[PDB]
Design a protein around this nucleic acid. Structure first.
Lengths: 103, 534, 175
RNA sequence: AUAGUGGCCUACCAUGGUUUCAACGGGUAACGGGGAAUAAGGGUUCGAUUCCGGAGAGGGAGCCUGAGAAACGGCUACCACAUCCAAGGAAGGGCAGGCGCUUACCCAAUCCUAAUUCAGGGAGGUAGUGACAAUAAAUAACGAUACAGGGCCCAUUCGGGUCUUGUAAUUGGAAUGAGUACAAUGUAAAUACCUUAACGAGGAACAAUUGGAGUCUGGUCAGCAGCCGCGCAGCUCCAAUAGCGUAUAUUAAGCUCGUAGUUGAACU
RNA sequence: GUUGAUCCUGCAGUCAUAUGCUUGUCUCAAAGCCAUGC
């Protein structure tokens, strides 16, 4: 980050990150270019999948992980996590409490 | 960023602004339309000829549209082309499970600016408790569905309705706040019809019959990317079908001309303009004496180094003449290359919120793709290992499928809305929303696999010297699969040795352990069934 | 009010619920605000222990502060020497609550049953019906705490559920 | 000259008038004070002030009424300056208001005016607007019986100490207001507020939550032998409570001379 | 006056910025663009 708390960005593509628990189920990562700086930053989406929701080529809101850097575990060196696509807050789309906009 | 850029520049006062009034059939929508146009034209015009051209000055002319709440098609057709949603509500909606599902359609196909209008909350409410109920609606909608919209509250002053400052607030929000761009709408030419004339090439036995379609001249204004560029292009008529246009009319020494004049040979283009085939790639040159003697000196390249439309149709057939009516609004689309084709399409789905069912693969589903509404059988499949090894029987809350079906193909991966159809007297909405998703990719000639199961139940097993007690009855089957590899759901594979002339289930096979006594010993990979075409 | 200095600390956290167990509260907010008023008095209590003997500040702002503690019904009059004021503790303001004084005076058979009897338009102390459990009785109002003229357990109406029980007998058994 | 004494203005004559416990010149971004709150009087805020004084009503010169105007919320003319045109001519002064960070009713009181014991007042008074905050407390209280116990704590241990326990609508009467509604008080005519008969519970109830762990239960996955393996759905427990998180920041363990400069005996 | 071993013990605060979820009752929260009117 540049010191602030968040950064809004654009999906370019969808990667592949797997897991060992419960078995080999895909945990994924996404590729987001920064709008304001142009640096290209990876991120992780903590849930059961939810790669299905977002899309290629849409507007996300990146957020910190809360460890002063310091990636969590066996996902390799990923430092940031995703909160809002299209302004409607993925967790609310996760339960069922919202339906996503057109784009 | 450029898709919004192509839209705004030709748009000016004769291209109108799209406004729909959507709501329940019982409430006075028509009264709000009359009192709304009472502000625009001077003070007294309270007669509805909708849709009609509302000349609101030289700054911004508009056109207003209402549709009844029982029509299943045009409720969808109005949702994707709108620029302002004006919803009229009653004092009796909010957990009505069958009347307010169109909210999700406007949610998914593109939401413009929306409005809540409260009118019957005065004949029903009489006390201070209406203030908490209005704020309760503000907790529900529209402040929760979009942050940045205004919930309006108006008096119940039904016919006899006010001209005063409250529709100056309504015409304040209409007059000031403009539209946000819709992505896949502005990449298409699309036009609303305004006037509608029927030209029959006057009376003859080849003018009326069972099969006769006549020359329909239709009239309106343009929206989106420009449609008049060329005659004979394609078009879609909603509810009726896809057609081409016959003839479109529009009402808002030079080599570059001689090349397009095809009565002239190209040597006469070169001949007139001054003074043989692409199967030879290497271009033409002259002789080595001419290029050599001509290019002895190299000085010659020394600087070379450092609006309104009148649209003609030959359509539509005679049976739609008997479906003539007051103009319940009709919209024209425009189909693109790689979407006039047919093909099998692969699309990501999930289950829909405020929906109360499950979806088997055999019940057909009504799908809205862009401008086209089509009934198609939604066969589902899943992978479980980044490769497919099964399909499913109905899409659950548990998993969320990869749906595949056959119809028109749509390359640009559009969002994808799926309505379960009901009749005109089942719920209170003309459809009810089954599922929603997105076109993931286009893929013709794909083949689903469903792995069935030949069954053998174990009882007393060892590793090398392995029988199954109860699995078969034919010997030649095992004679054919003796060159194969068998299994068990536990995951320790086997390989059948020999049938041993016992077609009783008992025969010798192989396992790379001894399969346990609470297992199920089976065989895999069955017939890859076809796709239902419709 | 004021939050305490440490939010989670073992010997104090369990000391919360043994106050919530006897008195029957619902929020430590209703514990902390009580200590907050006991905080402000006690700072003032140490101020008049520094100054001179028979200071009129120690007289007028001392003894009236002492008598007000006798007036609220907390300082017993035998300890009226301004040296028990430091020896005050938390439960004595909790003891003077309107909820707990009901149970002490028979009539409630619980501290939780009396909580329900406060908020149901029952027991008054003067001629004013009290329905806030923290009414802080002033020790001149103890033997006026009694069931209301209305609201049965006090008579002259049996009430909407007793009248409905009377209503059921007349319609099926009688007519 | 004016309503009026008067260098206020004009001609003559004289060369004068102020000032060292201080004339004049000059800074205080506070347009000025009396005043209103916290109450050291020092200070903060307002002085755009509750009372008044200076400025300006598109910019100009002239002119008026009234005892009281220098009237612009009076007039003529000049100058920039735009609106209509039947093409002769006629006309207003470039203004407010709002966003960018939806405004109504009434003179019943006070006082003022009145063609004045009538009524009026862009004087005056009465409703719209609400998690940055914050305020009280409801979501249940008390009885009863038959089945039944390997129930709980400490050392994650090896093991030890203390057994007063719950599952069943078994089941019964209590008690209430959230809300539904005449009446009256209020009365700018008047709205709300202070009151109120009439209703109103055995859990589908009259529908709290955001969290957190958990060596728990389930499903067809590298990759394969001489034999044996590996990696969404069932609940349980813990937390504050109409409040609870998340991200960023934040608090606690080379030699010597010599200037500015600094410091330095005693004593009638 | 000078060499070793054994035993005991020890090695969170923020009104401070944005954002997410739910709240039955009560009280208190420009020198840009124009809706409009002369």
């Amino acid at each position: 980050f540049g010191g602030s708390s968040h950064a809004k960005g654009i999906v370019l593509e969808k990667l592949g990150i797997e897991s060992k628990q419960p078995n080999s189920a895909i945990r994924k990562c996404v590729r987001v270019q920064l709008i304001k700086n142009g640096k290209k930053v990876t991120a992780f989406v903590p849930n059961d999948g939810c790669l299905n929701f977002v899309d290629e080529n849409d507007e996300v809101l990146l957020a910190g992980f809360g460890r002063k850097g310091k990636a969590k575990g066996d996902i390799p060196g990923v430092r940031f996590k995703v909160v809002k696509v299209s302004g409607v807050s993925l967790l609310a789309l996760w339960k069922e409490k919202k339906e996503k906009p057109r784009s | 960023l450029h898709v919004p850029m192509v839209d705004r520049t030709p748009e000016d006062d004769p291209p109108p602004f799209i406004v729909a009034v959507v709501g329940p059939p019982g409430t006075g929508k028509t009264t709000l339309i009359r009192s709304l146009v009472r502000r625009m034209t001077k003070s007294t015009l309270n007669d509805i000829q909708g849709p009609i051209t509302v000349v609101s000055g030289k700054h911004r002319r508009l056109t207003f549209l209402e549709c009844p709440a029982d029509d299943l098609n045009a409720m969808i057709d109005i949702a994707k082309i709108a620029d302002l949603v004006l919803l009229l509500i009653d004092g009796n909606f909010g957990f009505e499970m069958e009347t307010m599902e169109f909210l999700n359609i406007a949610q998914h196909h593109g939401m413009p600016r929306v409005l809540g209008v409260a009118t019957h909350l005065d004949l029903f409410k009489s006390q201070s408790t209406l203030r908490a109920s209005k704020k309760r609606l503000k907790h529900r909608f529209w402040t929760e569905v979009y942050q940045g919209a205004k919930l309006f509250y108006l008096s119940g002053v039904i016919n006899g309705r006010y001209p005063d400052r409250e529709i100056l607030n309504l015409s304040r929000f209409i007059s000031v706040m403009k539209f946000r761009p819709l992505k896949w709408r502005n990449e298409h030419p699309y036009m609303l019809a305004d006037r509608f004339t029927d030209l029959t090439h006057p009376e003859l036995i080849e003018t009326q019959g069972l099969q006769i379609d006549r020359k329909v001249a239709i009239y309106g204004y343009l929206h989106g990317t420009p449609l008049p560029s060329a005659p004979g292009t394609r078009v879609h008529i909603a509810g009726v079908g896809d057609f081409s246009v016959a003839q479109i009319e529009k009402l808002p020494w030079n080599i570059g001309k001689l090349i397009y004049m095809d009565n002239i040979s190209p040597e006469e283009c070169i001949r007139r303009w001054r003074g043989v085939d692409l199967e030879k790639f290497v271009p033409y040159f002259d002789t080595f004496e001419k290029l050599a003697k001509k290019w002895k000196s190299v000085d010659a390249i020394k600087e070379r180094f450092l609006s309104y439309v009148r649209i003609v149709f030959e359509k539509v057939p005679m049976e739609f003449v008997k479906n003539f009516n007051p103009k319940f609004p009709i919209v024209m689309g425009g189909l693109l290359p790689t979407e006039i084709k047919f093909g099998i399409v692969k699309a990501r789905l999930r289950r829909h919120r405020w929906h109360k069912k499950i979806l088997k693969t055999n019940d057909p589903l009504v799908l809205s793709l862009g401008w086209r509404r089509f009934q198609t059988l939604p066969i589902y499949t899943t992978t479980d290992s980044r490769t497919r090894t099964r399909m499913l029987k109905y899409t659950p809350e548990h998993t969320y499928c990869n749906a595949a079906f056959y119809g028109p193909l749509c390359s640009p991966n559009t969002p994808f809305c799926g309505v379960q159809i009901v009749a005109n007297s089942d719920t209170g909405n003309g459809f009810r929303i089954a599922a929603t998703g997105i076109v993931e990719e286009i893929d013709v000639n794909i083949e689903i696999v469903k792995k069935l199961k030949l069954v053998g139940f174990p009882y007393k097993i060892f590793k090398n010297t392995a029988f199954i007690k109860d699995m078969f009855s034919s010997a030649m089957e095992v004679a054919r699969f003796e060159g194969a590899q068998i299994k068990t759901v536990s995951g320790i594979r086997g390989e059948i040795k020999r049938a041993l002339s016992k077609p009783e289930g008992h025969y010798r096979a192989a396992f790379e352990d001894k399969i346990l006594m609470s297992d199920i010993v089976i065989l895999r990979s069955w017939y890859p069934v076809r796709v239902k075409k419709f | 009010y004021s939050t305490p200095k440490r939010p989670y600390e073992s010997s104090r956290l369990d000391a919360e619920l043994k106050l919530a167990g006897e008195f029957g509260l619902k929020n430590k907010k209703e514990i902390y605000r009580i200590s907050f008023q006991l905080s402000k008095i006690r700072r003032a209590a140490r101020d008049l222990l520094t100054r001179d003997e028979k200071d009129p500040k120690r007289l007028f702002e001392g003894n009236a502060l002492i008598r007000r503690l006798v007036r609220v019904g907390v300082l017993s009059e035998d300890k009226k020497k301004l040296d028990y004021v430091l020896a005050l503790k938390v439960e004595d303001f909790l003891e003077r609550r309107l909820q707990t004084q009901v149970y002490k005076l028979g009539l409630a058979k619980s501290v939780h049953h009396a909580r329900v009897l406060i908020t149901q338009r029952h027991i008054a102390v003067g001629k004013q019906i009290v329905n806030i459990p923290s009414f802080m009785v002033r020790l001149d109002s103890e033997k006026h705490i009694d069931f209301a003229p209305t609201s049965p357990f006090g008579g002259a109406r049996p009430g909407r559920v007793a009248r409905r029980n009377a209503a059921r007998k007349a319609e099926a058994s009688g007519e």
